[PDB]
């Protein structure tokens, strides 16, 4: 399953060994369980050293918006720069969090994919209940577009237009858009 | 389970519902879907073709169902020349109560222990925010359309109907009369 | 699954399903669970027989575990509305709305066969969701119960209080006990 | 899949399904599990056959595993109520409520074929819920067993005590054993 | 997909194929034997005796058997009625099917050259208390003793031999079934 | 996949990330509230008081709520213990989650700038007799009156306003929740 | 997912799961549905705590919907058997057998938190089969209700008659209502 | 789900699961449905404790609905084989093979707590297939029942005839009734 590594100076699972050097893996669908683990890792690493950079590695299709905002707010709240690196795919809220990294320190590997889209949801019941859920999800999208605007340097209007459908971007296209700063080269 | 009857006028065999239709009675006694709506519409148009002067009688024991199917029946009632009397037996709920109130003025009835339920329309939305936005706007406009027509038929204000249909509202025959959904409570002869 | 019978008169030979044959002699069979389809059949049959003859008695044979309350009331109100006396006969079992409709027959003309069972209960329902939604559903079924007890009081000669108490749990009765209660007038004596 | 028979008749040549053809000669088939649908069919048939002729015998052929007790009593009460003698013939198997209805035939006219099976047992039921609810259903099914045993005592000539002991578990009886018991009167001999 | 056949009269008359065969006193036992099948076969046997008490009846058997009690309903009706019941096996007569094949009128039990015959012991089951399992065992054992007793009388084989021969499934050719005493003749073109 | 963290001592000690946080008096309420979650949270609150009756406890909330009774187990333990319980909403505090957020020590209830807060009425159900439905309705209504009473005291809003505001699902931004009285401060970097 | 606590102790620094840590101070958690597994765990814990110290009080925290009656009586009988006083604290909810065990605590030492719920009701069960089998299960669960009511009478100071009426249907009680009833002794005040 | 306890001696600090801790003091928990896995655990525990000390008593605590007969007999024969007295204590419920094993404990040393239930019954099984296959299965379960009744006769002081009659249906007993029967010697009086 998950391999064990030995350091001379104990036994670590590979993910915990990376955390010792301030690397956090976001490598799954974002639910509350994932979000609370990332949050706790971010807070622990600040408590260890308030000044040294943190590195968030992202291979995620996204998931829950609220779970993603738990991570987003914790990134912005803490003193250290949180560097972000896209490996494989950062989609939806995973791409949102890729863009959330410290300005100048957001990366994607050359063949990594980035996807931007509008939030997904649903409601079943009375017209009033459907009205509430529609107004809530539209306000959630407004909140997402506004932050992405500030993050990428693109206008709210352009982001609305470009996320209307699923938008698949190359690592190059992600830089051009302003979702990342550099394509990390071999 | 559907019984057969014999008439003496030669002689002919009828299923009970076809026999009532002979005397211009239409039965709306199930969940309102497309099949039911198209049946009732065809029945209403046939009875007008036979006689455009004589009254038609729509007996209602229905939990409602599809709003558009209900509206297909509604629009046919209003288009045709004959007065369509409505009679609530057992229960008229949702689109069933809407169609009960759609009967010719002075000619909407309910039996003493019949129940009338009014409610807001039900639906669903899946997918993207804009897809949910369209679905929400559609069902809200559908409700506006329902509330407007009900207002005109009952005499009640649009907002009172908005308030009284927000949650499921169960009314007795007397309460439905007082509300303006019907005109008379049909008492034993 | 229903047998066919052949009938002979001035008009000749006619084939009937057995239930349609009984209907020709003003007998309606209430022999299933009560839903909207059954109710609408009964209602249509009651109205047809009044149109045929508004003086002659109608006969409702009941072998039913009840079912839908609103469906039963569609039958109930139709019985009361039409001019002819509607006799009721319990064969086998009249439970729930079945027993309500048995008590609904014309006074003096309600019967049960010596080994027929009669069951009386309170109405059954359900609610899932918000506290307000549950309140409304509770209030509806309580008012439905009030209506059932009020009518049953008139037909039996018992108080609403006694009916409330006796219907709190499922209450099974013999034919004799149903007669003593006022649900029926007579136990039908064999030949 | 049931066959159609053509018979030359007085009014004219006629096509019947075979079960309806048998009904013409006053034979009713009880050949399935006893539910409310089956019971109401049998009741209608017995009432139709009395209306045609109040004097001539009726013949009820039984190949049934039983089923519903109340549905069985709808058939029982109708048999006893009508004037004509109802003969009972067990073909294949009469079990549970099937065996009860076999025993219910007019005295001297209850038959089983040589290799036919008769099974007698106590009522089956259930209750799930509160202790009060389980008490009611237990008391109800126990009174139902008393009613069945008391009638069986009258019909077979055996004591309630003996029937109680003999029906505690499933009891399979041969045709000759059914005769000795008093469930039937005669084993039907090849003509 | 049961085909309709037409026959001329001094006009014309339509039959489904099976009802047409019954007119010439042929009963088809061509399915698994349950109570529904048994009561149908029993009624046909009784009807055909009523039409003619003298002329032979013909039972055509392509059945894998089924219910034992349903089988005995048919068996006892065959024995009761006065007409001779000829039995013809086409395809397969298994279990209670083969029992009823052997029950045909003496000298009048047939099987087609490639038709198969299977004899076996009765199948059943019980689940519950030891007392319940004992009763169900004693019942099925007595049923087997009843089957073996009659098969002995029909075949000429001893009760002990049939017990041995039916312990497991025994498949017989048409010639073997003749030799055994289950049939009298193999029917040749 | 809960990561292990290592800390130096005058040797070394391993912690799962959540147990490490508890050492500094942080309790994570980051799942649906059931009895298992409640008893875990209750035990942590009681343990931390036992360690130090003076120092603050910190409850971090990312919960969609769940059970009301399980929620009140946590609520009553917060009130009982002497230490001030600070509440911080990350991501979402919904239903009983938002109730427990509002239950934090006065002046010490927080939410992050993009964290969402949802208030609603309690959910339930009953299926059976009218008597059974009445009891279950009266019980859930009384539970709501209990929730609204406490929320009134915590927020400053009237019992009547909260009733109106929780009739349907009400989604609040971190700023709106502050203004409402559910939290005291929006936590800024 | 349950947290691990590190505590400095006399023998040395030690890692505990939080529930085992509480047990060290003589606290047992009853925080799930009561089945045989839960019951045997509680029994073992109560016996272990007597063995360590026969004099010092034990504390049973209850957040339980109830469950099995026999499993509940394994816990009840062990509480009464041991020498130490067993204090009971209702946190969140004590329902059915949960409320019974709350009432079972040493007199003067039964508590509920201000917003904690207490529910009392009659036993739940079932039977499916013969009339004899249903009789046995009905008589068994009725005797079980008598046993529970008789003990509750002793514990709360109310009559068997009152308990019978009050537990017929589900009865939800506030902490203060539980105190007036005598199920608990005290509502636990914020310190 | 099982709590951990820390123990102190000459050998220091040791952490135990609560059931392993009880086993150190020669207590075996029989607190589940009896299958082969449970039986093999009990058998291994019994043999280990004899190896440790062949004089000191062993204690078997029983909270069990029974299960497999052969599994129970593996435990039974192991109890009888080993030299130490094996005391039995019924907590909550000993039903079926659970009650058999309760009666299996050393004479004079079988206990039940005042509210513990004891149930006795006949063994349960099934058979599907040929008449010969059903006969064999019937004969096996009947002989299994003979063996159970014969042993229960010795341990209780009742006749095989009385045991056969009393075990025909599910028979529930109080602790006192179990003592009167000879299944246990003593009802365990509280402190
Ligand atoms: C090994 C474990 C280390 C745990 C680190 C937790 C931490 O840094 N929490 C953030 C809040 C937070 C939680 C979250 F989930 C997501 C976020 F983005 C942010 C925090 O408040 N940090 C404080 C320092 O720690 C605290 O002061 C105390 C004890 C610490 C164990 C827990 N605490 C708090 O949670 C409270 C809420 N924080 C405060 O009391 C102080 C003062 C009030 C405003 C919040 N706060 C601070 O903001 C303090 C002073 C400003 C610096 N300042 C922290 O860094
Ligand atoms: C025995 C079968 C009788 C069927 C009756 C159909 C009928 O009355 N249709 C309505 C339209 C309609 C359909 C529906 F589904 C729901 C509705 F509410 C209304 C109708 O058009 N009625 C006409 C009479 O019939 C028609 O003229 C012709 C032939 C008739 C067989 C079918 N037709 C039409 O469907 C068309 C659409 N109608 C017309 O052609 C004429 C002229 C154009 C406007 C519609 N129309 C009429 O309105 C005529 C005007 C003369 C009065 N005027 C009807 O009653
Ligand atoms: C061969 C088919 C015969 C169908 C018989 C229907 C019938 O008797 N309906 C009841 C209403 C009713 C329906 C129901 F479902 C359950 C009920 F309990 C009662 C009825 O109204 N009966 C009338 C006679 O019939 C009617 O006058 C006309 C035509 C008849 C085919 C249909 N109609 C009505 O449905 C309307 C509603 N009835 C009336 O218009 C008249 C006058 C307004 C009050 C109701 N009404 C009558 O009550 C008339 C005069 C009083 C006698 N009086 C009926 O018996
Ligand atoms: C071809 C259609 C034939 C229909 C025959 C029905 C019939 O005979 N019902 C039994 C009752 C009954 C029903 C049942 F389901 C199971 C039973 F066991 C018994 C019956 O009452 N028979 C009467 C004759 O018929 C009736 O008098 C009238 C009309 C008949 C169509 C229907 N009716 C009744 O149902 C009513 C209830 N019966 C009566 O009115 C008379 C007088 C009141 C007591 C019952 N009753 C009779 O008992 C009459 C006189 C005594 C002879 N006496 C019948 O045989
Ligand atoms: C077109 C429809 C033709 C229907 C043929 C029915 C018939 O033949 N029944 C067998 C009994 C039987 C039923 C069954 F399901 C399986 C069997 F194997 C046998 C019968 O009894 N046949 C009698 C003639 O018919 C009857 O006498 C009367 C009317 C007939 C419509 C029905 N009945 C009987 O069912 C009764 C039971 N039979 C009798 O009453 C007489 C006298 C009592 C003993 C039986 N029985 C006869 O055995 C009579 C006299 C001996 C000749 N004898 C029949 O052939
Ligand atoms: C490392 C483990 C720490 C365990 C902490 C348990 C604790 O604080 N329990 C609360 C009760 C409680 C339980 C719960 F689940 C939710 C709650 F909100 C509250 C408690 O009672 N605390 C006492 C101190 O502890 C106790 O006195 C004893 C031993 C402690 C191990 C367990 N006990 C009790 O549970 C009993 C019930 N408490 C008391 O006996 C005393 C006196 C009676 C009233 C309750 N009580 C107190 O309230 C005492 C005195 C007031 C201070 N006062 C506690 O702080
Ligand atoms: C750390 C491990 C501690 C284990 C403690 C078990 C224990 O106390 N069992 C209770 C019985 C019991 C079990 C149960 F599950 C629920 C209950 F309610 C009660 C018990 O009997 N306690 C004894 C002390 O322990 C025992 O004497 C011996 C060894 C102990 C390891 C196990 N034993 C017993 O189980 C036997 C049955 N008990 C006895 O032998 C003595 C004498 C016979 C009557 C029972 N008994 C006692 O009752 C002794 C003397 C009275 C005090 N008296 C205990 O407290
Ligand atoms: C620390 C592990 C201790 C394991 C204890 C096993 C044990 O006591 N087995 C019983 C057999 C048995 C197994 C079982 F599953 C359920 C039972 F009820 C009984 C046993 O045989 N016990 C012997 C002692 O042990 C043995 O001698 C040897 C080694 C022991 C590790 C295993 N063995 C046996 O299994 C064999 C079968 N036993 C014997 O060989 C001797 C001689 C042949 C007859 C059986 N037997 C004994 O009966 C010996 C001498 C009499 C005393 N006598 C045991 O107590």
Author numbering:
A (entry chain C): 3 to 11, 16 to 192
B (entry chain G): 3 to 11, 14 to 193
C (entry chain F), D (entry chain E), G (entry chain E), H (entry chain F): 3 to 193
E (entry chain D), F (entry chain D): 3 to 12, 14 to 192
Sentences from the paper on this structure:
Two rings of seven ClpP monomers stack and interact to form a secluded barrel‐shaped tetradecamer harbouring the 14 catalytic sites.
Here, in contrast, residues 4 to 10 and 16 to 20 are well defined in all seven subunits. D27 is in the direct vicinity of the outermost end of the aliphatic tail of ADEP4, corroborating a previous observation of Mabanglo and co‐workers where the corresponding E. coli ClpP residue E40 formed a hydrophobic interaction with the tail of bound ADEP1.33 Binding of ADEP initiates rotations at the key residues of the hydrogen network. The rigidity of the nonpolar side chain of ADEP4 induces a reorientation of the hydrophilic D27 carboxylate, which is the terminal amino acid of helix α1. As illustrated in the enlarged section, this tilt causes a marginal twist of helix α1, thereby shifting the guanidino group of R23 by two angstroms. When ADEP binds, it stabilises the upwards pointing β‐hairpin conformation. As all ClpP subunits within a ring adopt this up conformation, the pore lumen is no longer blocked.
